[PDB]
């Protein structure tokens, strides 16, 4: 109802489960209802432009978005006596944590479900005119019921689907950043979020992230050596990009994606291929990913969850600590 006014001592604080941009992230429990929540703390006195514009962003966008596969901001409370706390439904894990835990195995059917849910959320989020711009595993939460929620909307923004106007270039973390960004596109599309998810899909089938470098040039090289070199034959508009000439990879590699990942099942591989098209205009939409063979018929509610550790909340922070 009326947010920001109830006191944070309505909650019992259990522990720090995340360190965040503008504050620590806590696991806590509602003292009245017994509900589990996550608290993102917002410190105010340290910073001199007051309440963090990034928290303002998450608040503005999350309030507009209501979907079963997008994290819900329940309310906002305060230290009553002074910081604010953003309150979310508690999610037992995130994907980065689970993966680096080695406490679970995701087979094809788990992957079927995760990708189905993640894609329905992104489609909803794209059909509301928002880009996420920071899709990666630590930003995908999973509860013990096996439900996926897309989270961390701190870098999201409105985009125009009628007009074409310019947006910030440095937006997605590098290992999940698409070729058009790496070549300097500023008038980009929701296709940049699909590329990210394509990386998630591969990363769920293999152990680690699929393209790992430490600089943009080396990153584009890694991409190229598997996805093929950017060139007009597969991507006519590539020549219109600022860094196409300066960032040409070592060779003109031919695409070898279906070879380098032959362990991935056929239906999945087709999706993987289609999500990792170099040319964003050839890349599937979220809606198209969902019409593909791999996800078309998939109904997550009628599928059993993987057996997730009920005794250990596998979040990014916990993993890199141990």
């Amino acid at each position: 109802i009326d947010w920001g006014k109830r006191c944070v001592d309505k909650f019992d604080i259990i522990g720090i489960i995340g360190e965040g941009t503008y504050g620590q992230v806590y696991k806590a429990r509602d003292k009245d209802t017994g509900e589990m929540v996550a608290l993102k703390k917002v410190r105010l006195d340290n910073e001199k432009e007051g309440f963090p514009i990034t928290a303002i962003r998450e608040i503005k966008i999350l309030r507009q978005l209501t979907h079963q596969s997008i994290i819900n901001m329940k309310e906002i409370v305060t230290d009553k006596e002074g910081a604010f706390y953003l309150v979310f439904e508690y999610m037992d894990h995130d994907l980065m944590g689970l993966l680096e835990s080695g406490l679970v195995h995701f087979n094809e059917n788990h992957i079927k479900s995760f990708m189905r849910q993640l894609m329905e959320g992104l489609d909803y989020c794209h059909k509301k005119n928002f880009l996420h711009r920071d899709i990666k595993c630590s930003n995908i939460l999973l509860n013990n019921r096996g439900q996926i929620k897309l989270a961390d909307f701190g870098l999201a923004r409105l985009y125009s689907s009628e007009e074409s106007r310019p947006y910030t270039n440095k937006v997605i973390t590098l290992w999940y950043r698409p070729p058009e960004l790496l070549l300097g596109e500023e008038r980009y599309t929701p296709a940049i979020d699909v590329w990210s998810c394509g990386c998630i899909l591969g990363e769920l089938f293999t152990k680690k992230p699929i393209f790992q470098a430490n600089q943009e040039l080396a990153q584009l090289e890694l991409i190229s050596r598997i996805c093929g070199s950017p060139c007009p034959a597969v991507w006519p508009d590539v020549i219109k990009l600022p860094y196409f000439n300066t960032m040409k990879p070592k060779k003109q590699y031919r695409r070898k994606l279906r070879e380098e990942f032959v362990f991935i099942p056929a239906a999945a591989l087709d999706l993987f291929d289609y999500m990792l098209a170099l040319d964003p205009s050839k890349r599937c939409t979220a809606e198209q990913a969902l019409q593909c063979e791999f996800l078309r018929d998939v109904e997550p509610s009628k599928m059993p969850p993987p057996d997730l550790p009920l005794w250990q909340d596998c979040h990014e922070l916990w993993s890199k600590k141990r």
Binding site: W3, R63, G82
Partner: protein
Amino acid sequence: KPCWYWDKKDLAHTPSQLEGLDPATEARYRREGARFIFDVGTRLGLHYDTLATGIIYFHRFYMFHSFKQFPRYVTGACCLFLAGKVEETPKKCKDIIKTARSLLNDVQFGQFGDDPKEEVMVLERILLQTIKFDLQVEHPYQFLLKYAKQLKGDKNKIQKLVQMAWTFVNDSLCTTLSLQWEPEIIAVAVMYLAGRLCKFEIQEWTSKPMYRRWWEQFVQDVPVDVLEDICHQILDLYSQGK
């Protein structure tokens, strides 16, 4: 989402009236606060939507707090400061304070006390709580442009209508109109007022010219009476003089 609209009875029982502030003095306090927000943001070169968002926070703030307890210019600065962040057009609080110093006289700026920046920063917590963290707001400008763009008769008269109605939206922001009616409705009202002052028959610019109630194409269930009411409130700012 909360409810942000009050009737006439409610507006006559604001926290400022309850503490004995006369209606005329509260009306002047809101004008002054609103024009102050408008003038500071303009000198900082801010988007008209950013000014409007600031002013709407301002009008909402004083449905919950009294002017006798919260000096109006400090709140004004706080609301513009917050609006900038919300509308993705940030200005440093230090810039808002200098501009405020520039535009106010000594007594007026006295409101900010010994540490002007820190009076703004502490108010921001209270502001955010009062507006219930409902940050997103829409204004009549966008609807005025959307509706006028579907009018078809005379390119020149239509532009005169839009320009003058635009000015009335600016005026309307100095009044509690945004606490009374949705932006769409205000947008229709300023078109209606401009049309009458310009002796324009707006019906004739639509697909149904024989129908005097031309606005039903844009908004549902708005009686003439409400439009005339909005007109009188706006016209009151051109009071005898002014």
